Ligand binder design. Structure first.
Ligand SMILES: [Mg+2]
Ligand SMILES: [Mg+2]
Ligand SMILES: [Mg+2]
Ligand SMILES: [Mg+2]
Ligand SMILES: [Mg+2]
Ligand SMILES: [Mg+2]
Ligand SMILES: [Mg+2]
Ligand SMILES: [Mg+2]
Ligand SMILES: [Mg+2]
Ligand SMILES: [Mg+2]
Ligand SMILES: [Mg+2]
Ligand SMILES: [Mg+2]
Ligand SMILES: [Mg+2]
Ligand SMILES: [Mg+2]
Ligand SMILES: [Mg+2]
Ligand SMILES: [Mg+2]
Ligand SMILES: [Zn+2]
Ligand SMILES: [Zn+2]
Ligand SMILES: [Zn+2]
Ligand SMILES: [Zn+2]
Lengths: 129, 151, 48, 61, 196, 57, 229, 89
RNA sequence: GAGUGGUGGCCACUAUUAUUGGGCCUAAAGCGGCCGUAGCCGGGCCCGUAAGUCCCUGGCGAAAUCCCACGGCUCAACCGUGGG
RNA sequence: CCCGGGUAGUCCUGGCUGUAAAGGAUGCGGGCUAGGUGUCGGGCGAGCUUCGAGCUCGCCCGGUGCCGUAGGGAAGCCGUUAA
């Protein structure tokens, strides 16, 4: 059965970008997926996106630009402290500032660079590069 | 997929997204409640009442009208019946499954060698136990209520 | 075969049990812990 | 596009041949549809779309 | 309006497709007849012919190559090469013609015209490896893989191929300035088609 | 100064040194240069001219 | 460098080109090595590389990776054939790998060297290590992967002065390409030299498949082709 | 547990017979007139330690890191291995 | 090189114990098939709580042992003063 | 091994035994990733018709086969019925 809407969205995106699709539809929407999409758009990985209302949980429509090498979810959502971002970067990313880790903190969802600037930790939920 | 047969049927209803009742619908809420009570007194099941309303009176699902008493929730057939004391004591699907199991058991008394039909009985009783556990958790059944075929 | 299991966040006990269970299939580990060589060695662990 | 599911059935306004009454019915009934006044049959159920024996006036939205 | 009257197109049988179809060809399909046979849209054919006529006129005349394995297309490509000065290879395509410098007739063009991607698979395969633009005539059955400019038409009939190549030759001549008007081209269409 | 790496017209990605890409002037206008990468050619992705707006393989 | 200038001049005049690209090079319309890549040309004449990259003929810019002899069985005995795997490069930004066969060793070596030139590629270099951020093209700019047969190779950026932490075949191939420091991880059968070399070659080639932004070019000091001081 | 045991201050090669390494070390030994290989190895280890301290401090941050960074630079240029205006790189 | 060899043990080699990070058509390896209890994993929105989780700050986790700079034995090994 | 005979067994009723190359040598649930072409069940549209629960063509859903793109693999090969 369905267990993780967020993982399906990122796997769908990375599958679609490899065959040059220009847009995708994320089927079960949620606030968390919206936040992740906002963060991804801020750094220029995706184009514009919009929310479409059906009688069910709603759909997301996303424009792709062919600027993503890989995107995935992190399970389990490990907790991370404010000064331990380096080893996770080595575990998931290819260079010392290549891509972003997405962190859920008590102040919202943000990339690990902003969180390190604010000096706070949280839970890792995804990576994009 | 299906619970036991693992097939992947997709047939079902495709309800369009709408909030307010359509303009061409002319009945009011009170007329709908009267119709529901009348049909229930005719002896129909909850699922059948909605079918009759849709087919003959041109009323799509009654879940288009706000509940006049409680503004926070929409109106459903079971709530309408509860407001007048005609609600079933046992949830309808559990009652239907139990009724199916009783009829099958008296068949297997005359046909002890029908092993392929017996597996159907086992699956039916598994469904019954799942449902009774769920209903006990939510408080729709007394905690001492038990399903015994020997009854 | 599906994804390797268990992967859940609160599944430490089962994961540890699985790893302990399948470590006995390793002959080097089994001989060391049960001390099988010492039981049959005519030199009784001496080098000479 | 077709992301939002849309039904293929319709609600119809029909007129009874005998009584002259007008009703609104469903195009895919699962029961026999009869006039609310005279009781005559209006639509016969089938595997899919029903068979209409009355006069069609309008196809509602 | 049109290069030739639509009656001439229909008489030549350009619009007639086959019993099969492809997803990427549906942008050109007009409708499907009651016998299960698909029909092409003629206006798209005319527009693409005009565009292709403009496109081919910018190349050096002798660096254009046209090929045809099918019997009905051998005469039209030969006549087309004779009129426009482009090289034409009818019949069997010798493997290694464009990839093996030791062959006696080694030749590297700048643009190639494919009569049928299915039949001329060897020529297309060799043209892919040298990175030149590809112009092809496509029917309802073909795919558009590795095709840079597509001309929707029936590519199996005799009169159809004759008419298509006649039109294309006239368009090239007009665009490159060797004739001052369309009507000046005094060569009958029947001279492009194989007899008997 | 350095040299600029060509970019596919359809997908916008860079062209690798030894792939089966192609480039040609715009058939309709003849003023712009269209580049097609190997993947776009294989999958028959449509392209659109930046000057005249004419589109499609 | 003076010797190779006159060598290229000497080769250019007495050469009769047979292909379109050879004609372009002979007429002087193409003058730099980087102009023959990324546009789908076919490369079939070795003299092109000799004119454009003369220093690949230096004895110090060539490497004989391996030599083997294989047997075909016939009713009149065993027929022996030689397989030679070789590689060339300019130690700056270009590298090629090749295989040649022959009845005797010298013929196989000549053919292998010849085929290496035709398979020439250019790569990207930089510095992307966490513990060395110097913007100088001494390593791979980011982690890359390649594979061939059963062999999988992963290349990881390293600090300056570390050395080449990889097997000897990888050492030679990376040295011919102009890389000084790297970390690596492998899976599969590395004792199969041909697959190991091809996997390293593919890993180097894949540096062109990673999407990048103008900021990353400045941050990692990415260089394509020659360093150009 | 176990009490302290004093450890060697140099590291031996991973493989005793590599032709290129032997040639390079022979050149160094002949030029600077050392007695035995271990002496040479000692100096090599020193170099490595310096590098290993520089690699660790580049990727660090905080208050102690700055102190150790300036201490490393001061010690290195006190020995005469660096000019007065050198930086960590 | 005042050392250099032999035998036995542990780690590495080894992604041959695999959380990071392995396998199960034909090479070792998917129960003959299914139902289901504990366990593990679990759809969308709103309100509350603050156990997990994150940040700040008090009291602790002896000395010796480890890392760094300076100082004393000729330098060093060793020892002392400070910072971790 | 081939030929002429032949007991148990093979068949029915009530129990026990629980084994096969019991093999798709491929555990089960969910999301996504080019196409082409047969056939079985239901539904929808159009055209014929001897008016048949009939015939032909197109589309949707679910089963059951073959060829094949990206990708995968030591290869044989698998490839929306995924390995
Ligand atoms: Mg013989
Ligand atoms: Mg392979
Ligand atoms: Mg003790
Ligand atoms: Mg060993
Ligand atoms: Mg293994
Ligand atoms: Mg099984
Ligand atoms: Mg089995
Ligand atoms: Mg949930
Ligand atoms: Mg708490
Ligand atoms: Mg202490
Ligand atoms: Mg002193
Ligand atoms: Mg001192
Ligand atoms: Mg002390
Ligand atoms: Mg069987
Ligand atoms: Mg199917
Ligand atoms: Mg296949
Ligand atoms: Zn009536
Ligand atoms: Zn592209
Ligand atoms: Zn244009
Ligand atoms: Zn560096």
């Amino acid at each position: 059965t369905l267990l993780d809407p967020l993982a399906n969205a990122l796997s769908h995106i990375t599958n679609s970008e490899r065959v040059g699709k220009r847009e995708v539809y994320i089927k079960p929407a949620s606030k968390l997926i919206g936040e992740v999409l906002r963060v991804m758009q801020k750094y220029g990985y995706i184009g514009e996106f919009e929310f479409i209302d059906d009688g069910r949980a709603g759909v997301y429509r996303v424009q792709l630009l062919g600027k993503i090498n890989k995107a995935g979810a992190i399970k389990p959502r490990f907790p991370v402290k404010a000064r331990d971002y380096e080893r996770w970067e080595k575990r998931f990313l290819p260079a010392f500032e290549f891509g972003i880790l997405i962190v859920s903190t008590s102040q919202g969802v943000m990339s690990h660079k902003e969180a390190r600037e604010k000096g706070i930790g949280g839970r890792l939920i995804a990576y994009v590069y | 997929a299906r619970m036991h047969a693992r097939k992947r049927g997709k047939s079902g209803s495709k309800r369009p997204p709408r909030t307010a009742p359509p303009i061409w619908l002319e009945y009011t809420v009170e007329d709908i409640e009267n119709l529901v009570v009348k049909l229930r007194k005719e002896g129909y099941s909850t699922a059948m009442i909605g079918t009759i309303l849709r087919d003959q009176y041109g009323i799509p699902t009654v879940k288009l009208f706000r509940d006049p008493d409680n503004p926070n929730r929409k109106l459903t057939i079971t709530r309408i019946l509860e407001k007048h004391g005609l609600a079933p004591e046992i949830p309808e699907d559990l009652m239907f499954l139990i009724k199916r199991a009783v009829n099958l058991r008296k068949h297997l008394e005359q046909h002890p060698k029908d092993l392929h039909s017996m597996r159907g009985l086992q699956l039916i009783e598994s469904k019954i136990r799942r449902l009774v556990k769920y209903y006990k958790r939510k408080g729709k059944l007394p905690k001492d209520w038990r399903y015994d075929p020997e009854q | 075969p599906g994804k390797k299991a268990p992967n859940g966040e609160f599944a430490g006990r089962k994961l540890k049990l699985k790893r302990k269970k399948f470590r006995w299939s390793d002959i080097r580990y089994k001989r060391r812990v049960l001390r099988l060589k010492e039981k049959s060695d005519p030199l009784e662990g001496a080098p000479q | 596009r077709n992301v939002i599911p849309m039904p293929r059935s319709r609600f119809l306004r029909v007129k009874c041949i005998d009584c002259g009454n007008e009703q609104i019915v469903f195009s895919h009934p699962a029961t026999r549809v009869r006039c609310n006044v005279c009781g005559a049959t209006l639509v016969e159920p089938t595997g899919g779309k029903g068979i209409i024996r009355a006069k069609i006036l309008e196809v509602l939205e | 309006e049109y290069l030739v009257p639509l009656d001439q197109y229909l008489a030549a049988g350009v619009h007639i497709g086959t019993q099969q179809k492809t997803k990427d060809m549906k942008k050109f399909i007009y409708r499907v007849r009651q016998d299960g046979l698909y029909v092409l849209d003629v206006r798209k054919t005319d527009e693409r012919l005009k565009v292709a006529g403009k496109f081919l006129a910018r190349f050096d005349p002798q660096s254009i190559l046209a090929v045809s394995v099918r019997l009905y297309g051998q005469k039209p490509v030969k006549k087309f090469g004779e009129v426009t000065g482009a090289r034409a290879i009818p019949g069997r395509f010798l493997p290694g013609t464009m990839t093996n410098p030791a062959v006696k007739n080694f030749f590297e063009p700048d643009v190639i015209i494919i009569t049928d991607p299915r039949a001329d698979h060897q020529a297309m395969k060799e043209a892919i490896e040298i990175g030149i633009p590809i112009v092809a005539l496509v029917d309802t059955e073909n795919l558009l893989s590795y095709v840079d400019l597509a001309i929707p038409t029936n590519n199996k009939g005799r009169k159809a191929l004759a008419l298509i190549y006649w039109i294309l030759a006239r368009e090239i001549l007009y665009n490159r300035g060797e004739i001052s008007s369309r009507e000046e081209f005094k060569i009958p269409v029947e001279e492009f088609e194989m007899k008997i | 100064l350095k040299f600029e790496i060509p970019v596919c017209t359809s997908c916008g990605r860079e062209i690798t040194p030894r792939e089966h890409a192609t480039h040609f002037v715009c058939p309709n206008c003849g003023e712009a240069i269209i580049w097609r990468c190997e993947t776009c050619r294989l999958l028959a992705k449509p392209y659109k001219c930046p000057k005249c707006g004419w589109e499609g393989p | 460098s003076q010797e190779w200038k006159e060598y290229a001049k000497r080769v250019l005049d007495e050469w009769q080109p047979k292909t379109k690209l050879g004609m372009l090079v002979k007429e002087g319309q193409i003058t730099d090595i980087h102009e023959i890549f990324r546009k789908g040309y076919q490369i079939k004449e070795p003299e092109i590389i000799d004119v454009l990259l003369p220093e690949v003929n230096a004895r110090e810019n060539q490497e004989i990776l391996d030599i083997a002899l294989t047997v075909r069985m016939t009713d009149s005995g065993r027929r022996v054939r030689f397989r030679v795997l070789a590689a060339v490069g300019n130690r700056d930004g270009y590298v090629g790998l090749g295989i040649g066969h022959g009845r005797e060793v010298g013929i196989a070596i000549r053919k292998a060297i010849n085929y290496a030139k035709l398979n020439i590629i250019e790569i990207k270099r930089g510095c992307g290590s966490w513990e060395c951020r110097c913007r100088r093209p001494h390593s791979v700019p980011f982690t890359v992967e390649g594979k061939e047969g059963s062999v999988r190779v992963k290349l990881i950026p390293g600090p300056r002065g570390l050395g080449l932490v990889i097997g000897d075949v990888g050492k030679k191939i990376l040295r011919l390409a102009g890389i000084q420091d790297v970390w690596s991880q492998t899976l599969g059968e590395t004792r199969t030299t041909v697959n190991f070399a091809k996997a390293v070659f593919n890993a180097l080639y894949n540096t062109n498949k990673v999407v990048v932004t103008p900021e990353m070019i400045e941050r990692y000091g990415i260089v394509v082709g020659r360093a150009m001081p | 547990g176990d009490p302290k045991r004093q450890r060697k201050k140099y590291e031996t090669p991973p493989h005793p017979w590599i032709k290129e390494r032997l040639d390079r070390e022979r050149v160094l030994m002949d030029k600077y007139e050392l007695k035995n290989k271990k002496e040479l190895w000692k100096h090599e280890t020193q170099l490595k330690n310096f590098r290993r301290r520089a690699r660790r401090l580049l990727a660090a941050r905080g208050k102690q890191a700055e102190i150790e960074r300036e201490q490393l630079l001061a010690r290195l240029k006190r020995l005469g291995l660096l000019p007065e205006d050198a930086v960590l790189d």
